[PDB]
């Protein structure tokens, strides 16, 4: 699943908040796609909707949400 956050050119960073989310680790992380204005990562085994949950109560506090 596709999760965009409002943070783009205007990796590392969103390796690093994500894989420390509970349940979470490296593994789980594909594709990192970074725009102009909004960048979006691949979240890998089904995963998607419970680090989307857990980044609504996470700092880096970017807006999040469903590409799809």
């Given at each position: 699943?596709?999760l965009?956050?409002?943070?783009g050119?205007?990796?590392?960073?969103?390796?690093?908040?994500?894989?420390?989310?509970?349940?979470v680790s490296?593994?789980?992380?594909g594709?990192?796609?970074?725009?102009?204005?909004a960048?979006?990562?691949?979240?890998?085994n089904?995963?998607g909707?419970?680090v989307?949950?857990?980044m609504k109560?996470?700092?880096?506090?970017?807006?999040?949400?469903?590409?799809?």
């Amino acid at each position: 699943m596709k999760l965009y956050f409002n943070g783009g050119k205007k990796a590392v960073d969103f390796v690093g908040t994500i894989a420390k989310i509970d349940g979470v680790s490296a593994d789980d992380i594909g594709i990192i796609t970074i725009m102009d204005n909004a960048s979006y990562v691949e979240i890998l085994n089904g995963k998607g909707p419970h680090v989307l949950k857990v980044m609504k109560n996470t700092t880096v506090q970017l807006k999040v949400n469903k590409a799809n």
